[PDB]
Design a protein around this nucleic acid. Structure first.
Ligand SMILES: *[C@@H]1O[C@H](CO)[C@@H](O)[C@H](O)[C@H]1NC(C)=O
Ligand SMILES: [Zn+2]
Ligand SMILES: [Zn+2]
Ligand SMILES: [Zn+2]
Ligand SMILES: [Zn+2]
Lengths: 150, 75, 109, 94, 97, 60, 79, 60, 98, 80, 109, 94
DNA sequence: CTGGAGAATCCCGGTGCCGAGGCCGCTCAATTGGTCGTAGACAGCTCTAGCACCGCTTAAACGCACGTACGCGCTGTCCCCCGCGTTTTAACCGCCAAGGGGATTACTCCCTAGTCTCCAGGCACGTGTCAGATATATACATCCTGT
DNA sequence: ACAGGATGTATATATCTGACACGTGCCTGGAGACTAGGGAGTAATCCCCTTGGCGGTTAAAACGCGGGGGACAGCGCGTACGTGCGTTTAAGCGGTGCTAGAGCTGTCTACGACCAATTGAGCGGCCTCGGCACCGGGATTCTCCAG
């Protein structure tokens, strides 16, 4: 509540607790409210079903004005994420708007899980599998969902 | 024919399209009046994953329909 | 017979020619060796600056109710932006004119 | 018949990228060519000077980074470094 | 008959000239001046029309900037009429003398 | 409800006192000014470009 | 010979008008046409030096641009 | 006061959701369209003249 | 009876004194504190070389002296002898620093 | 290291003015002199720190400051 | 056992190091090839300029009645001479001071 | 223990030649060193820049002469060019 | 406008010291001497473009009358800055102590120079059309002078 | 302040026209694959300069007070500069013609990069002394106030 970013985080947590989207969750860090921890259930109708992905986020002071930074903690296989977990987001690097909130970010990344962007080859192997070897692609998605439980 | 497309921040954007228009063309119009490149969009109707190569009539999209425009993203 | 050639600009998602920038860097004799990412980075920077200035000039021309950018529009776009003006503080644009301003003292009252 | 070098095609591509329905005069194209050449010259010269300073022999991305940071003022510099880094990471990933 | 009070025509002239971008000097006499100046260094040179046009553009830009600065000086002195004192002050401060 | 309804959406700290002519939105003037000066000539609401003459002070 | 007069009084007046002055003292004309001559001499000396270096006889737009840009007065729209 | 503030003053019964381009006064839709159909280029606050292109829908 | 010089004579005397010497007119330690504070905003936990600080101080004094010569010329032009913020602003605007 | 600009002290500014050749100094000069000096110091220190952090060191150096000044068109002699 | 090594500075009758100048010209990647007479000419120019400035500084020091040249003398020599002042108008000499002059208006009447 | 190069010896020799009975302080020596380095960089950069303009690949006495004519003003340039031409003629003669 | 008083300045003399100046390794940078690939000088051809001229139009310059707005000088004032004495502050100098980071050395390995191939993006050349300038009848805003 | 006539100035319509945006052939430079070698990224070590602290001196900063001179407002005079008209003038446009030389291509030779071997002179260190800043005393001069 000391700054607009902090109060925005307060209301974002309030909305997440009051009415979180389907198959998503979030939690702060005890020692740094600016740090965030989330768990997402895989979207239906996609190979990512029954997926339990762990995320970590970092914020700054002028947030209602900049996009934050995000990265995976669990294993990932997606054309829109780098191997280490540098996740490729337009509303987060190119087309950020202050209107977006943490819940919107979570839903957007779930939608990205649903559909990789064809012109976003963060993982060239994953992009090629999606483009051509669709079967092997959902096989890899199922494998990553399998080890996502741990 | 006016259609409704919903965003993630409580906004609904009105698009004038035709049933024969492709999803790619709808995304291009969304680029024109909302600055979202077509490759940076994922359009969903009635829980179905729309594809750029298909048309609105293929997915049975009627007048005043609500489309959930959640992007497919690149940073 | 090797593979479908993809130009480096396309690989990086830019419109400016990465290969041409690399050739200019090598030929200009700026350093004994040139890194791989230097042309990419420089091309990105040039593309951004060109896009910015063109966008401002187009905005000015549209505000003037015309569909063709001209040196007058370029001059207005530059000189109306403090940062671009600072970057181009010591440049003369042919057929550019000047910003219309008059000191308040001179105006009648 | 000697071939001549210019950036007209790319300037035009960027123009129709940003404003889909706007033209550009020939004199405007010439001015933009001169501007692009001037900026390229400035940044290349600064990068070469930095390399000579550090007793290095190669112009890698870091020298261009710092040269841009020195030339462009403030928000221009910030945005330029952002997009340039974006481009270089995209390339290396490719 | 109708008669404008002095000054308003000056304001109109400023408004019209600060909007256009044509050349404010006559091409042939400027060219003759350039050739006369150049003939001192080396004789019987030839000039490209584009080169002479570039010289005109540079000269007009320089003089216009100088006149903005000398106008600022004149206003500083609590006047409205520029003077050679103002011109020389501007030149001296900008380090040209 | 009312305070949220008619306060500047993006910041939600002060009032609606500006209009963006291109998309005809209503935000607060200082939000508009800072986004312009930071070179985000691109609407927050409909995500559309504009210039220095496309937004002006409004009162409600 | 004696072509500085080609820079006529009304030409100077309209230049100053573009500058943004309301009224102009009577002595400004001589001073400004002296300043212009000085500036022309300074630029032309460098242009002629460049062309003489290049074994040429025709001063070129590129030569004038280089001369101007040597004085921190870069000119756009000629090469 | 919020209802009275947000409703247009020409009628004071319908919500004000239109802005006049040159003078920037908030009014309703159909009152303004009817006035313009009545040939009156008249503003109730500034008496400024307008035209068919000097108004448009705005939503808060 | 106390002796008091006319206002101005000692001013000219100290002008003549200061245009004759070459010492550093700003206090070194407070200038160093100011430099460190200013650098605080770009990179925390920075270290400085004494030579670097002296170079900065020399450059700054030279710049201010030049600015004040130009300001004095402006004030004389305005038909007065006291320099003022408007004079400083004119000098900077003409030189193109503002 | 908070609010040290007062270190640039009134008589010091007067001494600088005298070296400049000023007979009388108005009472308002000091505020904008502080402002001008501060602006100049940021403009130089930013470039110096940029050079330093490019060279991968934590110590600003006389050579870095000299290069920054030369870049701004005010070359300084006597330091290398 | 070839012959006595006569350095190029001695051969050309200069004082500055022709070999050193040539080495710097090569190492500075100013050009890929360097002519033979370029270092000689550059050394001649440098020697002439330094001799001129040093002569003026020595004259100033002798007028001041000192046997040593110091930044103050160098500053005075540079600025008093009009050509050198134009050549070095943008430099700052450490411990230089300024030229003693007062606008005539300030002086009492 | 790195060895750093300077022109102190040569400055001192020319100083003795011009004024046999004058010394020069260390700080003055440093100022002269910096001045010599600055002039060298100016002239060499201008000469290389001319070489690039004229599609040439070799700096020569002509390029240096044109560079000095461009940099040095008036009578100083005249004397400098006379000294340079004399020096090169003597060198080629010997 | 002309003379003493007092402060500031200038001039001469003895003295200490620390920085300029001279001298001794020696090691690396300069030098000398071939050698070879080629960048640049030079001859020749061309056809582009600059220089020169002439006739007609008319836009712009030039010259003159005027009266008025502004530049410039004189005067009063008061308040803001300067000179000076006194007290308070912290800069400066010397010394000491700890260690983080600048500078150098070795190794390796990963990046980039150099080469051959080929093929497609970009450049020269053609071409039709729509944006823009121009002429003309408006509708409306603005300046100047009487009221 | 208000009103109306005269004069700019903005607006919609119709029109030519040529610069531009597209399309086509083709061609040479960028992409791909490969190899070889050296630039520098990393690790370890040394020790140098930076930072921090302390205490004593005193030089400079802070504060206050008196007063005087200079910034600023006002007023009045005159003169020279903007405004408009009528009379030059020569710039500008067109068309023509001629020819220097800018640009290109083809040859051929001095010439600078490169390598190897040789050596001496300039850098680091290391003494050594006098130029100079300083402190003390005497002589000179500028400025202020009373006359
Ligand atoms: C640009 O890059 C900087 C560097 O970290 C980053 O902080 C900033 O958010 C980026 N801005 C964008 C992607 O618009
Ligand atoms: Zn807001
Ligand atoms: Zn919008
Ligand atoms: Zn209404
Ligand atoms: Zn109104």
């Amino acid at each position: 509540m000391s700054t607009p970013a902090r109060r925005r985080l307060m209301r974002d947590f309030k909305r997440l607790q009051e009415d979180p989207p389907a198959g998503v969750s979030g939690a702060p860090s005890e020692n740094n409210i600016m740090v965030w921890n989330a768990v997402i259930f895989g979207p239906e109708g996609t190979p990512f079903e029954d997926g339990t992905f762990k995320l970590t986020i970092e914020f700054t002071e002028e947030y209602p004005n900049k996009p934050p930074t995000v990265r995976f903690v669990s294993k990932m296989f997606h054309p829109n994420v780098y191997a280490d977990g540098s996740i490729c987001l337009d509303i987060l690097q190119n087309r950020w708007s202050p209107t977006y909130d943490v819940s919107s970010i979570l839903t957007s990344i779930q939608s990205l899980l649903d559909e990789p962007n064809p012109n976003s080859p963060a993982n060239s192997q994953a992009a090629q599998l999606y483009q051509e070897n669709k079967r092997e692609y959902e096989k890899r998605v199922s494998a990553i969902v399998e080890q996502s439980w741990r | 024919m006016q259609i409704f497309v919903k965003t993630l921040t409580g906004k609904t954007i009105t698009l004038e399209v035709e049933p024969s228009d492709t999803i790619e063309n709808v995304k291009a119009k969304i680029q024109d009046k909302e600055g979202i490149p077509p490759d940076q969009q994922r359009l969903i109707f009635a829980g179905k994953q729309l594809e750029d190569g298909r048309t609105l009539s293929d997915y049975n999209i009627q007048k005043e329909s609500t489309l959930h425009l959640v992007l497919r993203l690149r940073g | 017979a090797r593979a479908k050639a993809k130009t480096r600009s396309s690989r990086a998602g830019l419109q400016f020619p990465v290969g041409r920038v690399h050739r200019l860097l090598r030929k200009g004799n700026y350093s004994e060796r040139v890194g791989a990412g230097a042309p990419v980075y420089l091309a990105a920077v040039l593309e951004y600056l060109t896009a910015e200035i063109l966008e401002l000039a187009g905005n000015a021309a549209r505000d003037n109710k015309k569909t063709r950018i001209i040196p007058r529009h370029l001059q207005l776009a530059i000189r109306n932006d403090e940062e671009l003006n600072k970057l181009l503080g010591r440049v003369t644009i042919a057929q550019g004119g000047v910003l219309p301003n008059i000191q308040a003292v001179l105006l009648p009252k | 018949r000697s071939r001549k070098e210019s950036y007209s095609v790319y300037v035009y591509k960027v123009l129709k990228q940003v404003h889909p329905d706007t033209g550009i005069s020939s004199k405007a194209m010439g001015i933009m060519n001169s501007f692009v050449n001037d900026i390229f010259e400035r940044i290349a010269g600064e990068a070469s000077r930095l390399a000579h300073y550090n007793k290095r022999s190669t112009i890698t991305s870091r020298e261009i980074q710092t040269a841009v940071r020195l030339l462009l003022p403030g928000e221009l510099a910030k945005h330029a470094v952002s997009e340039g880094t974006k481009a270089v990471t995209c390339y290396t990933s490719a | 008959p109708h008669r404008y009070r002095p000054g308003t025509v000056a304001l109109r002239e400023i408004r019209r000239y600060q909007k256009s971008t044509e050349l404010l000097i006559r091409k042939l006499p400027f060219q003759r001046l350039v050739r006369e100046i150049a003939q001192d260094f080396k004789t019987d040179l030839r000039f490209q029309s584009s080169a002479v046009m570039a010289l005109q553009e540079a000269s007009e830009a320089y003089l216009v900037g100088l006149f903005e600065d000398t106008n600022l000086s004149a206003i500083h002195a609590k006047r409205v009429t520029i003077m050679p004192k103002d011109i020389q002050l501007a030149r001296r401060i900008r380090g040209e003398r | 409800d009312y305070k949220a309804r008619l306060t500047c959406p993006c910041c939600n700290m002060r009032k609606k006192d500006a209009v963006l002519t291109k998309c005809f939105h209503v935000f607060c003037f200082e939000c508009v000014k800072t986004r312009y000066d930071t070179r985000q000539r691109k609407c927050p609401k409909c995500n559309a470009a504009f210039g220095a003459n496309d937004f002006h002070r409004i009162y409600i | 010979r004696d072509n500085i007069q080609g820079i006529t009084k009304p030409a100077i007046r309209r230049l100053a008008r573009r500058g943004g002055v309301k009224r102009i003292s009577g002595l400004i004309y001589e001073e400004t046409r002296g300043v212009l001559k000085v500036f022309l001499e300074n630029v032309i000396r460098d242009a002629v030096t460049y062309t003489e270096h290049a074994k040429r006889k025709t001063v070129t737009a590129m030569d004038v641009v280089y001369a101007l840009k040597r004085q921190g007065r870069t000119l756009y729209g000629f090469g």
